[PDB]
Amino acid sequence: TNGVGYQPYRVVVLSFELLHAPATVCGPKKSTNLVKNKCVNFNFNGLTGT
Amino acid sequence: QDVVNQNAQALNTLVKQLSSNFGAISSVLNDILSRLDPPEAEVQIDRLIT
């Protein structure tokens, strides 16, 4: 009967820290074969770089 | 030996500077680019650039 501002809200929060170690919690990015001796992009567990 | 050591020290300071946040939420461009979008990254990018 009250207003929406007075109705209860099912609330959550997603806390997560960053950049310490290869984690085990991240997205469905599909791996691929490795290749060497060609300067190429990469992304290892989150660590990017070229 | 003096001048060589001095240049070494200067360059070392210069390069080490890179790993400092200067009040930005990171110290890696590509990082912020990954975890942030222009309308909110631009400010951190500005901080770092300055």
Curated annotation (Swiss-Prot), chain B:
Coiled coil ranges (UniProt) are: 1-45
Q: What's the impact of mutating residue 34 to A?
A: In strain: Alpha/B.1.1.7
Effect listed in the UniProt record for changing residue 21 to K? In strain: Omicron/BA.1, Omicron/BA.2, Omicron/BA.2.12.1, Omicron/BA.2.75, Omicron/BA.4, Omicron/BA.5, Omicron/BQ.1.1, Omicron/XBB.1.5, Omicron/EG.5.1
| Function of the molecule | Subunit of the fusion protein that is processed upon entry into the host cell. Mediates fusion of the virion and cellular membranes by functioning as a class I viral fusion protein. Contains a viral fusion peptide that is unmasked after S2 cleavage. This cleavage can occur at the cell membrane by host TMPRSS2 or during endocytosis by host CSTL. In either case, this triggers an extensive and irreversible conformational change that leads to fusion of the viral envelope with the cellular cytoplasmic membrane, releasing viral genomic RNA into the host cell cytoplasm.
Name-wise, this protein is: Spike protein S2'
Recorded source organism is Severe acute respiratory syndrome coronavirus 2 (2019-nCoV)
- Organism phylogeny: Viruses, Riboviria, Orthornavirae, Pisuviricota, Pisoniviricetes
Chain's gene name: S
